[PDB]
Design a protein around this ligand. Sequence first.
Ligand SMILES: *[C@@H](CC(=O)OCC)[C@H](C[C@@H]1CCNC1=O)NC(=O)[C@H](Cc1ccccc1)NC(=O)[C@H](COC(C)(C)C)NC(=O)OCc1ccccc1
Ligand SMILES: *[C@@H](CC(=O)OCC)[C@H](C[C@@H]1CCNC1=O)NC(=O)[C@H](Cc1ccccc1)NC(=O)[C@H](COC(C)(C)C)NC(=O)OCc1ccccc1
Lengths: 306, 306
Amino acid sequence: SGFRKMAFPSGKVEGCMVQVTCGTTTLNGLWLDDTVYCPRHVICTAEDMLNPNYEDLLIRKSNHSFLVQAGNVQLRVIGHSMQNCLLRLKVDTSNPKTPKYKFVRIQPGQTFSVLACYNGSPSGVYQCAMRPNHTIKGSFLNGSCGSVGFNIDYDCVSFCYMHHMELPTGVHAGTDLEGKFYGPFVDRQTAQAAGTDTTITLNVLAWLYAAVINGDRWFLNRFTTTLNDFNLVAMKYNYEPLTQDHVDILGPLSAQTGIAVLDMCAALKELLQNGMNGRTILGSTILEDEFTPFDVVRQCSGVTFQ
Amino acid sequence: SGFRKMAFPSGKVEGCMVQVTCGTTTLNGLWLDDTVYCPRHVICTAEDMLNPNYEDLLIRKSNHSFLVQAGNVQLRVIGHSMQNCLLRLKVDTSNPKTPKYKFVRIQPGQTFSVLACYNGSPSGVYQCAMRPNHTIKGSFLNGSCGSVGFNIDYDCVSFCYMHHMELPTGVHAGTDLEGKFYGPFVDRQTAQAAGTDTTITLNVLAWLYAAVINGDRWFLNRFTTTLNDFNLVAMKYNYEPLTQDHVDILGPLSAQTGIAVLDMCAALKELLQNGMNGRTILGSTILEDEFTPFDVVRQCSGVTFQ
Ligand SMILES: *[C@@H](CC(=O)OCC)[C@H](C[C@@H]1CCNC1=O)NC(=O)[C@H](Cc1ccccc1)NC(=O)[C@H](COC(C)(C)C)NC(=O)OCc1ccccc1
Ligand SMILES: *[C@@H](CC(=O)OCC)[C@H](C[C@@H]1CCNC1=O)NC(=O)[C@H](Cc1ccccc1)NC(=O)[C@H](COC(C)(C)C)NC(=O)OCc1ccccc1
């Protein structure tokens, strides 16, 4: 029993974190086989973070412009190239701790673990959702750039995020490991703001199923709803519209609990309209939207506490 | 910016997790140097979990009664002994991945990271506080026994918890790494219940400081309180009494924000009496009590957003 925001074990990722220095700028890099990946803003001049031309900045660099440190060991850079908003540095040594890995671009509403890092040294690990507005609600300080997000399946690490910047609202923006930003953001310190965010409906429903699996039914009701009638309410409360695909994704959780998806939607409709009446769900006074259906299945028992 | 429940990176601990089997019972063990530590209830007969006499059960075992698996490698047991509620198994191989480590008994209100494990395989990592009633609000399923809790300072792992049991309320009980239970619990399936819990006042105050450091002041007020007058209110709302030692611990956070501890106590008094008026603090609609002053200092900027 219990239900916690749970990150993946971070060991396979810790073995890949290095420090990258260009001029007086230091940030984190990710070392896989003979390549080190890092945010390309490491090459920005101290004087110009507003209008960098990265092609013009990079052509002025040699391999020995870049210093790469893995623990106390210096890695010699033997090649470099830009890929979108990252740099790919070739080094003289393949990382002996390289795990089985893939690069994946995650989708809005999906979750991942973040390994917060400073000066190539891992400091903490926590779970994040990719928000509908393509930001994450992370926890990052100066020095955290190049920290990575990932998921693990069996023994394969799926890297999905590298950290680049903080927006005015205190939320975070970054790229996949091909260097393409999540959302409309750009790596320059020109004024940018996160779009309006939305509550991840699918995740709220998954979490209500988690609550039932774990033994709590207080918030259910005798009613049902149509998908379209639910969506009228969803719009009012700034929830994402529910789709048939989302209904199908919830099949396994529905089956384990014996609660039809549209019946759980009716329960959710009532919670939105009436509130929770001073009660909690899985220890929460609010409706949680950062657990996916996959996350619920991973963490909860396969046997419902009936 | 941001504020998240953040666990320590788990790699140093993952390298120590093994599987221990006696008869048909399998659980997790912790492998450090040439010793494997695990819950002694691994030796319980399938028929008797109510009244085991562990001395009588253990004397009936040989070294080869115990099977220890590290990944796909079998570790030969060459000695065994009971220490309180754990078994200490001596094995033929010292763990080459043994980190610098200490065993520490943590105190109520303090936090640690839990590495949830099944069949010797780490599955997830999350942060827990030791509750005043000596339980933790974990997330554990069948097979999780022997999962460990820890903190990390510099490169030293301070192990503080090994998991043994779940109580009727869905909360968790276990031992330190000397095998002594936290709280009045015993490792037998005789009826037991967690004592009434209390809110960790020191942590709530630390978290209010975190909110100020990160830029939010909405909940402050023009008032102060005496320690004793605060405690009258604390009793009413089931908060731990605040002591001068707790006031002294909050010195550094008070200094960084320019908010005197008793002034923050007045702010907290008002929040208890009046509620939060539909507002949130660090994204929370309630008062969070699972971040210590140390946790706040670890995670927040050393510069207040004034
Ligand atoms: C990682 C690098 C670093 O630490 O540099 C030293 C400050 C850092 C990660 C953030 C630090 C605190 N929390 C974080 O998540 N990233 C940066 O500082 C970004 C650096 C950069 C990006 C692109 C080109 C060149 C440099 N910059 C930002 O995150 C910046 C905010 O700066 C700080 C110092 C306040 C964090 N964000 C930004 O410029 O957003 C666009 C914007 C929005 C509104 C007004 C102006 C600009
Ligand atoms: C770890 C071992 C395991 O998985 O065994 C197979 C079930 C497991 C961890 C819990 C599983 C689910 N969540 C957990 O945190 N621990 C146990 O199952 C404990 C085993 C044990 C303890 C002491 C002597 C011998 C065996 N037992 C319990 O946690 C038990 C609850 O059992 C389950 C199966 C429902 C989890 N708790 C208990 O007996 O508490 C005392 C009590 C309270 C009220 C009425 C009767 C007894």
